[PDB]
């Protein structure tokens, strides 16, 4: 009856909002490209507060954290490649021969022994040096003359070899007055009302791994193997599957390389590939045929729920495009592998090994181009020794064609971050609340 | 006792969550120019701005340093005709803001002048 307005400060009510999310990291100290030393240390007690009775709406396909991480990672790379060497003198006519013939037909030319004239510390005196270049990084002229692949499109910048391309888990945090909402639903689709919700100040550790087709070193599902797409009935929307069991992959570049520093000027030093100690072998990846067949069947079962128990789905290899998207391209110890995946997506499944593994023939690039703008590329300096990384495959990036056929791909860098930021959402706190009661001032 | 944590009573009734206001009150506020450094500086200036806008409104209403202040603005039933028991023992603060959202600007003015006139009345009473 006698009701007046009463103001409350600190009411549990929030609205959806976009804000700047700062990074948190764990104490590890050289320096990585992700500048994880420049982040605030994460609390050793990552507080999670469960929001009982709360049901929130999520939409990973409109989430801004994936749009903010997509640009932060690009900025972290632009920042790290800023003070490094500009290899513009490397855009010169190369005299190339095969290095060490008699291997296996079209394999001597996969990497070349290229010699070229180069500037020195004195601008008036040249030097004739040589370097081992992979075939994917050079093109002919039409004689045995070659040039770097990037010279007619993009400038080139070699990474400061003291920086590490190793991904370090990143914790995105919301500023004070904001909150991160986690959808703790074990069988969550990515959109819609999430019944179990908790709030956190910072997200979990998110390694900024940029792979293709296969999602590496990611987070796993707790139940079944979920499948996420905004319009699954649309064939042009990438399907982002996420395993619950990690199917291990073993990649290696067995060639024992040597890095030969070449001074291209005062202070500037281009790191060439000296020679190969030992055998000239082929880089490849192993994945247990048994575990991959088992995990490929789980995806089939969860794909039946969107296309019928009776339909037949088929896995085919990539249908074309750039090199980074037709292969399982990724980074392993510094070198950038490009793995043929025809041996992983070559299976048809009906309506209703056990010892060996399936190997993946991988090629290697050094002049890797930029994924966004054109006119820019990076020279990955050669890594000495033998490279062999062991990583988990926790998801895929498939694509339907409109009985059913699924091929992989995904050159978009933000699809990787959707696979880890799907369960998070940014909201702003509005602690002012007016409501009636029979209370009056004075 | 209970202590549900920060926003722990977001799904609780308005009368229940109205007893855990200090929980949300203390979490509303707690240089190299790198990509992370610029990011963190923006998070710092934004937090102090949002915190002081609410403290400003809390000041022009005569509610400085109050979690629960009572006003003199009567409840126009056109805002919400719901009774007290079906509000504090029923609704949550989230859905309450959802149906009072249209009139939140109307109320913010009535509280602003009720405080301006009250302090003018208090000066007249202490003038003797």
């Amino acid at each position, epitope marked *: 009856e006698n009701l007046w307005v009463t103001v409350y400060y600190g009411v549990p009510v929030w609205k959806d909002a976009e804000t700047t999310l700062f990074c948190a990291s764990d104490a590890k100290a050289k320096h990585n490209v992700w500048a994880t030393h420049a982040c605030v240390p994460t609390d050793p007690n990552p507080q999670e507060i469960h929001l009982e009775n709360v*049901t929130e*709406e999520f939409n990973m396909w409109k989430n801004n954290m994936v749009e903010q991480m997509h640009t932060d990672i690009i900025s972290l790379w632009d920042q790290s490649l800023k003070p490094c060497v500009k290899l513009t003198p490397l855009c010169v006519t190369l005299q190339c021969t095969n290095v060490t013939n008699a291997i296996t037909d079209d394999m001597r030319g996969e990497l070349k022994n290229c010699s070229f004239n180069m500037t020195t510390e004195l601008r008036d005196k040249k030097q004739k040096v040589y370097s081992l270049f992979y075939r994917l990084d050079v093109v002919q002229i039409n004689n045995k003359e070659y040039r770097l692949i990037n010279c007619n499109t993009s400038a080139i910048t070699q990474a400061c070899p003291k920086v590490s391309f190793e991904p370090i888990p990143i914790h995105y945090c919301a500023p004070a007055g904001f909150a991160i909402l986690k959808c703790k639903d074990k069988k969550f689709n990515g959109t819609g009302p*999430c019944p179990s919700v908790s709030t956190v100040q910072c997200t979990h550790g998110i390694k900024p791994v940029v792979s293709t087709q296969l999602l590496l070193n990611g987070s796993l599902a707790e139940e079944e193997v979920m499948i996420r797409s905004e319009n699954i009935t649309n064939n042009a929307k990438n399907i982002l599957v996420q395993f619950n069991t990690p199917v291990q992959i073993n990649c290696t570049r067995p060639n024992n390389n040597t890095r030969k520093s070449i001074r291209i000027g005062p202070g500037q030093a281009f790191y060439a590939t000296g020679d190969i100690i030992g055998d000239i072998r082929q880089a490849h990846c192993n994945v247990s045929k048994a575990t991959w067949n088992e995990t490929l069947g789980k995806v089939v079962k969860q794909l039946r729920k969107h296309f019928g128990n009776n339909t037949i789905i088929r896995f085919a290899n990539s249908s074309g495009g750039d090199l980074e998207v037709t292969t399982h391209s990724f980074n392993c110890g510094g070198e950038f592998f490009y793995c043929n995946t025809s041996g992983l997506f070559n299976s048809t499944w009906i309506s209703n090994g056990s010892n060996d593994s399936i190997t993946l023939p991988c090629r290697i690039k050094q002049i890797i181009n930029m994924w966004q703008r054109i006119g820019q590329a990076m020279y990955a300096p050669p890594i000495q020794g033998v490279i062999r990384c062991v990583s988990n495959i926790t998801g895929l990036i498939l694509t339907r064609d409109g009985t059913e056929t699924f091929r992989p791909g995904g050159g978009d860098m933000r699809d990787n971050w959707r696979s880890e930021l799907y369960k998070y959402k940014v909201v702003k706190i509005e602690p002012l609340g007016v409501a009636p009661t029979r209370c009056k001032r004075r | 006792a209970v202590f549900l944590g920060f926003l722990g009573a977001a799904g609780s009734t308005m009368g229940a969550a109205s007893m855990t206001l200090t929980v949300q009150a203390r979490n509303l506020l707690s240089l190299k120019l790198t990509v992370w450094g610029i990011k963190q500086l923006q998070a710092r200036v934004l937090a102090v701005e949002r915190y002081l806008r609410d403290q400003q409104l809390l000041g022009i209403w005569g509610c400085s340093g109050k979690l629960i202040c009572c006003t003199n603005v009567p409840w126009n039933s056109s805002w919400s005709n719901r009774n007290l028991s079906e509000i504090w023992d029923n609704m949550t603060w989230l859905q309450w803001d959802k149906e009072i959202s249209n009139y939140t600007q109307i109320i913010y003015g009535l509280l602003e002048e009720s405080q301006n006139q009250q302090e003018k009345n208090e000066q007249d009473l202490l003038a003797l």
Partner: nanobody
Amino acid sequence: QGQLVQSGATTTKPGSSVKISCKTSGYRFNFYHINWIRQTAGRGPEWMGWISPYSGDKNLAPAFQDRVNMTTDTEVPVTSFTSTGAAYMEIRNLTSDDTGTYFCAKGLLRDGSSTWLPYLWGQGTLLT
């Protein structure tokens, strides 16, 4: 809003055990109790018992202490404040003297002294 569609009005004979369904809509099914009320012809209307779709805690009259099984399945979130639920009712040593119209009614408020009070009822089901 809120709806509570009930099952069919079929009939059986003594000694059996029928199940009554009550499907909810337009309100968070977990926030209010579900009551079962009986309007017999040879007796005044009787309150059989309520159950909590949130805590699973049930409470029935001693006249139905060991003869009635009340169960509810978890809800399905529709929006932030809308879900769909279902409540089930059973009888054990059943005769033909329990004939009448059976209703399901959700609780009144979420807190206070009239929490479980049957507020929003269903359309009822005729029995044997």
